[PDB]
Design a protein around this ligand. Sequence first.
Ligand code: HEM
Ligand code: CYN
Ligand code: CL
Length: 118
Amino acid sequence: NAPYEAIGEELLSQLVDTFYERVASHPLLKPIFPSDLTETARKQKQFLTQYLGGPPLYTEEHGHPMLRARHLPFPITNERADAWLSCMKDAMDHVGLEGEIREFLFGRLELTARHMVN
Ligand code: HEM
Ligand SMILES: [C-]#N
Ligand SMILES: [Cl-]
């Protein structure tokens, strides 16, 4: 079954809200994000749902995701990709994400965040 089913709607929503609480405290990232992260988190949940083989919530609403393009306006450094990743690792610790679903998600996120570097 789809890897999204190994995490689910509730835990995914908690992973992502936790993540954006950390982003909002992270001095390198907070400046380049919106001041209000309410909408970003809503869109990452849709996106992460799609990314984990669940319904394509993101495309359905915003269109074709082409993330590297959507990210190009912003100054994504290697060191910023690393802060995002660090925030995300911490967020996973907090919700107690573990095992093969943590390995699959995070391993993919690592490859994606580096592909965001511009
Ligand atoms: C390299 C570190 C990253 C930085 C600094 C970064 C930064 C940003 C910023 C500033 C926004 C604008 C917020 C908004 O428009 O709502 C954004 C949106 C978004 N990011 Fe990233 N991002 C990074 C990596 C990633 C990764 C790895 C993913 C994949 C899970 C991702 C997925 C998204 C999505 C789905 C949006 C919303 C796009 C939209 O507005 O439709 N980003 N990001
Ligand atoms: C991008 N969060
Ligand atoms: Cl892409």
